[PDB]
Amino acid sequence: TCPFYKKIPGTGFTVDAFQYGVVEGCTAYFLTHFHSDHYAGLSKHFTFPVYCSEITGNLLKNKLHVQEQYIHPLPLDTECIVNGVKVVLLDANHCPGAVMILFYLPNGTVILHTGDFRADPSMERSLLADQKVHMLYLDTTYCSPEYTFPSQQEVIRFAINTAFEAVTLNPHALVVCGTYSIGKEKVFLAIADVLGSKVGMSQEKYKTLQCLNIPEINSLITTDMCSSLVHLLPMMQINFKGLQSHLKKCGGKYNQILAFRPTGWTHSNKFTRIADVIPQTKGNISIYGIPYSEHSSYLEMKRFVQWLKPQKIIPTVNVGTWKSRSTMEKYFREWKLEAGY
Ligand code: NI
């Protein structure tokens, strides 16, 4: 059965609610983004209307086989009527195709559902500027002050400089980057660009990237591993064993691997600056964990919420323990007392 924080009151609508069977009274199922915890339950046998971005629609059709007649893509930054209710989709600054959803309810209430997002000051100049929000359904993944990490631009700067130095010292080094879902593609695209290479990958991953409307993609990626000196591998293989095994398959073209594991936050963020990050090394294999986040830091979340001044906040992450819920409610009250709303 569908929990309350996935229902939109006064509508026939649900958000990211595909794992509960037929939800009673649901006339339209919204999907914020193509991450498996959120799409859990969708397949080619789904027969209700799905509302989403163009990019999420390409992934539902090609990767999960959902039939076309049930896919309803909406443009961004555009007022749309769905089953008699005005809605707007906004870029969430998460993975490709990820949206926030503004709902203008028949009684005058306005609801923002962030999906998953990385709050940014540029959101203060979207269609959010114009009007009041009564309820905020908020991605609270990192809602605690210990959760700090750098900007995505600093992280990318570190990765490009590290890869360019290693391969210039040793032209026979291979670079490998881990992946397990969509998102974070800037990591491997920026590294391949500085190295003058396409990115090599499996047919399955190529198919997924082909759904993403990335400009000039055909010039950036390939399934011909032999032509490429940046390879993608599943995240599970980014360890000394998996990487040894990969280097054997490359036919003595390379004598060294430099690898990247994009994570979210890890406790080594509480001590070490991005500049000071060092790898794990065994022999001719080095593995860097880099903190590339597609979710708000605590500070970015607090700034967003203090700017929007919602009347009520409903968290959508970390909702399963009393201690988590109590912690998040304390911070919401500090934020409100500090800013005066
Ligand atoms: Ni996500």
Give 250 Cα–ligand 1 centroid separation in angstroms. Answer: 33
Does 209 share its domain with 116? no
Distance 285 CA to ligand 1 centre (A): 30
Residues 29 and 97 in one domain: yes
Residue ending a domain, choose from 258, 280, 295: 295
Task: Please state, in angstroms and as integers, the Cα–Cα distance from residue 323 to each residue in 42, 90, 297, 318, 327, following that order.
Answer: 32, 32, 20, 10, 6
95, 182 contact by CB (below 8 A): yes
Q: Quote the strand ranges of the chain, DSSP E.
A: 7-8, 13-15, 28-30, 50-52, 71-73, 80-82, 85-91, 99-104, 110-113, 135-138, 173-179, 199-200, 221-222, 230-234, 256-263, 280-282, 285-291, 312-315
Q: Provide the 3-class DSSP secondary structure of residue 333.
A: helix
Rounded to the nearest 5°, which phi and psi values hold at 76?
Answer: -80, 160
Are 88 and 119 contained in the same domain?
Answer: yes
The CATH number of whichever domain residue 112 belongs to comes to 3.60.15.10
Joined tokens for residue 51: 């509302």
Claim to verify: residue 83 and residue 51 sit in the same structural domain: yes
Strand partners, 29: 14, 50
Within 8 A by CB and 6+ apart from 262, the residues are 177, 178, 179, 184, 187, 290, 292
Residues 22 and 29 sit within 8 Å (Cβ to Cβ):
no
Q: What type of residue is 251? A: G
Between CA 183 and CA 32 the distance in angstroms is 14
How far apart are the CA of 262 and the centre of ligand 1, in A? 14
**Nearest of 113, 86, 98 to residue 11 by alpha carbon:** 86
Residue 264 alpha carbon to ligand 1 centre in Å: 11
Same domain for 290 and 162: yes
Ligand 1 centroid to residue 168 C-alpha, Å = 35
CA of 93 to the centre of ligand 1 (A): 11
Same-domain pairing of 157 and 282: yes
Distances from the Cα of 67 to the Cα of 26, 39, 53, angstroms: 19, 15, 16
Looking at the fold, whether 290 and 153 belong to one and the same domain comes out as: yes
Shared domain check, 241 and 291: yes
Overall number of domains in the chain:
2
Q: Specify the DSSP class assigned to residue 237.
A: G
**CA distance linking residue 314 with residue 223, whole number of Å:** 44
Method used to solve the structure:
X-ray
Q: Where in the sequence is the domain holding 87, given as residue range(s)?
A: 1-147+296-341
The CA angle 263-264-268, to the nearest 5 degrees, is 85
Both 116 and 29 in a single domain?
A: yes
- Strand order through the sheet with 71-73: 7-8, 13-15, 28-30, 50-52, 71-73
Ligand 1 centre to CA of 65 (Å) is 20
Read off the amino acid at residue 206. Answer: Y
Residue where one domain finishes, among candidates 257, 275, 295: 295
C-alpha of residue 252 to centroid of ligand 1, in Å: 38
Residues 91 and 99: beta-carbon distance below 8 Å: yes
CATH number of domain containing 216: 3.40.50.12650
Neighbours of 161 (CB within 10 A): 12
- What's the 35 CA to ligand 1 centre distance in angstroms? 5
- Please name which of 92, 178, 119, 44 lies closest in space to residue 335, comparing C-alpha atoms: 119
SS3 content of the chain, % helix, strand, coil (to 5): 35, 20, 45
- Chain mean position to CA 187: 13
Query: CA 321 to CA 316: how far, in whole Å?
Result: 13
Kindly state whether residues 213 and 333 are assigned to the same domain.
no
Q: Please, are residues 205 and 181 in contact by the beta-carbon 8 Å criterion?
A: no
Residues 220 and 303 in one domain: no
Helix extents (H) in the chain: 36-39, 54-62, 152-169, 186-194, 203-209, 240-248, 298-308, 322-339
Ligand 1 center from residue 281 Cα (angstroms): 31
| 91 and 45 fall within a common domain | yes
Q: How many CA atoms lie within 13 A of 52 on its CB side?
A: 28
| Residue 122 identity (one-letter amino acid) | S
Kind of pairing between the strands at 99-104 and 110-113 = antiparallel
Cα 37 to ligand 1 centre (Å) = 8
CA of 263 relative to ligand 1 center, distance in Å: 13
CA distance 130 to 61: 35
Residue length, the chain? 341
The pair of three-digit structure tokens given for residue 215, joined into one six-digit string: 């400009």
Give resolution, Å, one decimal: 1.3
Q: Domain ends where: 258, 279, 295?
A: 295
Nearest 5°: the CA angle 241, 242, 245 is 85
- Sort strands 85-91 and 80-82 into parallel, antiparallel or unpaired: antiparallel
